């Protein structure tokens, strides 16, 4: 499933704000003829990966590490995506895209009243290139400058980021008082491969809800998706979702901050192999929060270069100069391991000021 | 090809369970077949037990000595709350904690969910027959010669016909068994035995594929092991006034 | 492959009525009591019932609508007793007063209680033959229906005059929201196989010995039992199957 | 009526947020060839089952016990649904769904101005499984983790939860000033079995109103629907509607609480048998409020287990720890009956604190 | 028994006249029938072992509704022979007393461990009384006798014998309980809903 | 079918006596065949040994040890006066006490009357 | 398997790894490689057999 549509040579500006990621998928190195498709009903539950408030005019990272992921719409220990990583050793992507092999989609949704109005920039970078993720988080670069970025305007008078399910019962709710159940069942049984409207979500459009969604790529060198958690700190595989709310004014023409959103995810694009029994080392889902980000050893000079080619990171009192003094301090620390964390570049101490942080770093 | 051995049994083509839902030799990364429904009027879905039904899992070891009395011996298999079938990764409790209802197949005339394999290695200096009863009630009997292999599908304890203290009306009327009350149990005894002065013990193991179990209502995965209090089965199956 | 179904045969039907009543009609063409005035029926015209425990066919009023009776067979143990050891058993009742009410509860034979005692759950259909001998100056007007929930609830049934049609016959099928009740317990609020007799009027002479007796035969027809009860694996022995040696002097 | 549409194998994510409840209906044990259809005009009045305010971010139970139900849109003693239970002994469902045999639909509606915006999660569990109902009420589990949950976004700029009737007169209101009566009559006489738009509710859509609706299942072991009220406390049959309003912010970006909704219901999917006269024990419709919930004796360890596998129910000061101390106290009481009520686990006293409540319970 | 098996006819097969002149007759006929196992030790060379037939509880209940019966019998004898087994056995059917020997089979369990037998009903009276029987009857008994013991010193002798017995086709005669009274159980009654 | 045994011999079809007068497996109530005459010129009658010729009777037990010398060992079978072949009922002496003369068969070239079976059970050692 | 009745068994272990072409002297951490695992289930032997076979 989850096809590979061929675009045109030139992208039409009325649909896309960036060029296309590629004109063909990138299915080398992935061993697609290897597993066995395993469609159980547990795969059809989505996962509430992120829920909460998100600051306006700042890129927010959502580390989308599906092996150790937590579900905020469920109180249990495992969920629909992480139990798939408990049961099997090998997960094999079905198809691919312009970034890498792709294993799922995400969905951003936000129920807003009509008195606020803004827009959302979103992109999901594979994690083979985490520099482009981290440079966007630190305010050094914007999301509009990398291919694959979409813009969706949640306001509104606008029916964009919204979820409408219409329950999967065999009755279809044919005796409903004062209105029609739109797109539920006993309208159309639209296939997962096809992409159509039912017939009733063509004149409704409150229940049609043009979604804010992308895909979940992994990385373009692995053959399958065997998770070890020591190897993926050295060569990361799982992607990172980048979200940026831009304008968001109120009816008093006052710029808002910290809007509420929530992100759903599913992984319905994989094949399985090597079913495992009574194992000891498990992928250890962290309770109640998240994963963080891993910056490996060979990514340091790429993060270092992007601060240096930024005129705003040198002047004091700005947000980029805070991260850059926190970045130079962590490089002068003592690391027994071969990677640092984004949280280490947020909860660190401070010195004075920029140049002496670099002279002490070329000696260490 | 030339060694003195005492191995050989029924050659499982002659056994009567399914041989496609419980495959004799599945291919290395393939998935097993979906089992048959009890009746055409129940709800149906895609199976979530396909990869799990290709794996005989180590459950328990029983010792096969010279019997003294004539009594049976009950082996209780509760796949819902048992810290041997819930380890990490792909364990057997995973279909029983994603679902609300569960059932089996009615190919023999009664519902019969989980299957157990008893394979017996023996030296040539011991011989005998193990007798395995399908449930607590006077159900079907499987005879296991020493040095042979057999598979025994098991009745759930709910559907054995006996009137117990719990005994809900949906137990005799519905084939759907709310998943936490789905324990199965078999009885065994040694029915024939002869030996020499060389061996006396003859330990065997019980393998536990979850063949022809079905499920109905797909929830989101519940927590694996209840590490709080183990008194919960007494507040579940006794029900004081 | 299914375990095989075994059959046992019973041979010549104990307590069978082989000389029936002459006032009970055998065919529907020889019955017109609904037409003129004798039977006022709210459940239809009587249909022909063939049962082995009564020699000749008879027309019966359907107090409930006939159905198929789903029998769930998922647990261990199932049996079709099915008119075996079945009989029409009579009892005498006096006719009630005009305000009161008479509930006839069904009965069954000893040999039906033994074989059905090997199981836990059952359902069955029921038949009734009501006979009121009306001597001369009888002006009784009766009412028969099936009870539903409590003491006062009235359903659709038949009203009849015993002076002109002395024998009436009824057909009571199994109607319950649970198939296969427990034998010794039953569901609370069930109908079962009970019928209700009620006196409407007493327009009789002074010479008739009132509270006039009513005779009701009851037969417990097609029985399907479920749930094998005795988990006894031990072996038994009687002297008839043994080798008895000749005693040596 | 009220058909049984067959879905696809994999549910399309643009319509459904959960997997399908089943791929076929579950019509065993129900005796469909038994009654007689009885279509009187009183059946075409819906019943206002719930009306009032409902708290945000908390699952609200609506016990949908149709034998004893009250109508808030009518002042009389009986109503359209409960008089059907007065007149007859046996009610027989026509068709079934993935949960059970189904007897009707519900409809949630809410007239909101454009300055507030949220979403609604709703599901209606059969009551054969009341544990999944009660675990969601107590905050132990969410609605997104069980099959059959729908999500509808009432805001809004959105035309979702709304009722438009357009009166059933034979004139059709053909002389109407300044606008067309949409979907009333003298447009189309759309059948109850078919599911179409008239021709005028295809370009209107203010009067089309994509509804928030599901179905009313009963239970998968009963043969018909004979109500006794003693047996249904031991083995419950009637369902429970679970409603959860999620986000609901205002134009000041302030999270609301306690929104107003109201719920309609109908039962137009049944057959009748055994018409009853001058009865004494009636199904006793309770005046002016509701039914409550019955938790039978064999459901205690299922409620007990779900508190134990919840890390939030053990820490003090939270909402789940209040219910769990109220749950352990009621189990240590004296019950002459074989069931407890949800109101007993709300209006109970308090002790100290968790562990001593369980040690005193294993002795009783 | 699931699969067919070859059996030695210890008596010649016949038709078994069943007299049906009195009131009451029934063909039980492999209903509630099972092969029931028991263990015996092999006797000494001089002594003798008589296996008496057995039958299930549910066969004793239904046949307990009658007075007279006859049936056929089947036996499956299994002697597990480990290594140094040189047993030579002898099986036949007893006739009148303790010493009488008839035509039967002799076999070596080391090379054919399982033997099976077929014992039909042979009696000068059809339909004996169940609890009494005829004096001097054969019934369904078999006789096991040890001929030789050419085994090692290591074999644990008096080697055990397992004998399954099944009581096949049963025809009962004579209706026993003259009970005309009526019985009632709560399952067939009308149970009214209790009023508050 | 799978046990370690050391049994197996000549499969008596290959033996040379009669196989109809000495049947290998007679039916349960049938009678054996009448044997052949030594010559066609002797007197003949109906056989009175038909039911008796369907029964191997326990005669004597011999012990089979490691031999020391090379000598033979004679086993004398006198069916006329021997208190093992005359018990009660159907014994073997009964044709020898209803008759004046007796003979055997000459299928090998000399008269050869009574037949003896020696079946041997053994452990594999 | 039971070695008394089938003494010789043979196996086929193909290359399965999430990286093709590991370094020869290093390998990937967590790889399978070409290892197999032998485990004893039961020991129903005589007293005369010299065990640990």
Coordinates of N, CA, C and O in Angstrom, one line a residue, chain C residues 68-73 78-82 116 121-126 174-176 178-183 220-226, chain E residues 187-188:
Chain C
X68 N -38.9 -21.9 15.4 CA -37.9 -22.9 15.0 C -37.0 -23.3 16.2 O -36.6 -24.5 16.3
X69 N -36.9 -22.5 17.3 CA -36.1 -22.8 18.5 C -34.6 -23.1 18.2 O -34.3 -24.3 18.2
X70 N -33.8 -22.0 18.0 CA -32.4 -22.1 18.0 C -31.9 -22.9 19.2 O -32.3 -22.6 20.4
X71 N -31.0 -23.9 19.0 CA -30.4 -24.7 20.0 C -28.9 -24.5 20.0 O -28.2 -25.0 19.1
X72 N -28.3 -23.7 20.9 CA -26.8 -23.5 20.9 C -26.0 -24.8 21.3 O -26.4 -25.4 22.3
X73 N -25.0 -25.1 20.5 CA -24.3 -26.4 20.7 C -22.8 -26.2 20.8 O -22.0 -26.9 20.2
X78 N -24.7 -32.8 24.2 CA -25.9 -32.4 23.6 C -26.8 -33.7 23.4 O -26.2 -34.7 23.1
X79 N -28.1 -33.5 23.5 CA -29.0 -34.7 23.3 C -30.3 -34.2 22.9 O -30.8 -33.2 23.3
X80 N -30.9 -35.0 22.0 CA -32.3 -34.9 21.5 C -33.1 -36.0 22.2 O -33.1 -37.1 21.7
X81 N -33.8 -35.7 23.2 CA -34.7 -36.7 23.8 C -35.9 -36.9 22.9 O -36.1 -38.1 22.6
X82 N -36.6 -35.9 22.6 CA -37.5 -35.9 21.5 C -38.6 -36.9 21.5 O -38.6 -37.9 20.7
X116 N -33.1 -36.8 31.2 CA -32.8 -35.4 31.2 C -32.0 -35.0 32.4 O -31.4 -33.9 32.3
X121 N -29.1 -28.2 30.9 CA -29.9 -27.2 30.3 C -30.8 -27.8 29.3 O -30.5 -28.8 28.7
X122 N -32.0 -27.2 29.1 CA -33.0 -27.9 28.2 C -33.9 -26.8 27.7 O -34.0 -25.7 28.2
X123 N -34.7 -27.2 26.7 CA -35.9 -26.5 26.3 C -36.9 -27.5 25.7 O -36.5 -28.6 25.2
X124 N -38.2 -27.3 25.8 CA -39.2 -28.2 25.2 C -40.4 -27.4 24.9 O -40.7 -26.3 25.3
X125 N -41.3 -28.1 24.1 CA -42.6 -27.6 23.8 C -43.6 -28.4 24.6 O -43.3 -29.4 25.2
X126 N -44.9 -27.9 24.6 CA -45.9 -28.5 25.5 C -47.2 -28.6 24.8 O -47.5 -27.8 23.9
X174 N -42.1 -23.2 23.0 CA -41.1 -22.6 23.9 C -40.8 -21.2 23.5 O -40.4 -21.0 22.4
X175 N -41.2 -20.2 24.3 CA -40.9 -18.8 24.1 C -40.2 -18.2 25.3 O -40.7 -18.2 26.4
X176 N -38.9 -17.8 25.1 CA -38.1 -17.3 26.1 C -37.0 -16.5 25.5 O -36.5 -16.8 24.4
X178 N -34.0 -16.5 26.6 CA -32.8 -17.4 26.7 C -33.3 -18.7 26.2 O -34.2 -19.3 26.8
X179 N -32.6 -19.3 25.2 CA -32.7 -20.7 24.9 C -32.0 -21.4 26.0 O -31.1 -20.9 26.7
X180 N -32.4 -22.7 26.3 CA -31.8 -23.6 27.2 C -31.6 -23.0 28.6 O -30.5 -22.6 29.0
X181 N -32.7 -22.9 29.3 CA -32.6 -22.6 30.8 C -32.1 -23.8 31.5 O -32.1 -24.9 31.1
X182 N -31.5 -23.5 32.7 CA -31.2 -24.5 33.7 C -32.5 -25.2 34.1 O -33.5 -24.6 34.2
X183 N -32.4 -26.6 34.2 CA -33.6 -27.4 34.4 C -34.2 -27.1 35.8 O -35.4 -26.9 35.9
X220 N -45.2 -33.2 27.6 CA -44.0 -32.5 27.4 C -43.3 -33.0 26.2 O -42.5 -34.0 26.3
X221 N -43.5 -32.4 25.0 CA -43.0 -32.8 23.8 C -41.5 -32.3 23.6 O -40.9 -31.9 24.6
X222 N -41.1 -32.2 22.3 CA -39.7 -32.3 21.9 C -38.6 -31.7 22.7 O -38.5 -30.4 22.8
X223 N -37.8 -32.5 23.4 CA -36.9 -32.0 24.4 C -35.5 -32.1 23.8 O -35.1 -33.1 23.3
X224 N -34.7 -31.0 23.9 CA -33.3 -30.9 23.5 C -32.5 -30.5 24.7 O -32.7 -29.3 25.1
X225 N -31.7 -31.4 25.2 CA -30.9 -31.1 26.4 C -29.4 -30.8 26.0 O -29.0 -31.2 25.0
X226 N -28.8 -30.0 26.8 CA -27.4 -29.5 26.5 C -26.6 -29.4 27.8 O -27.1 -29.1 28.9
Chain E
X187 N -36.8 -26.6 35.8 CA -36.4 -26.1 34.5 C -37.6 -26.0 33.5 O -37.6 -25.2 32.6
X188 N -38.5 -26.9 33.7 CA -39.7 -26.9 32.8 C -40.9 -26.2 33.3 O -41.9 -26.2 32.7

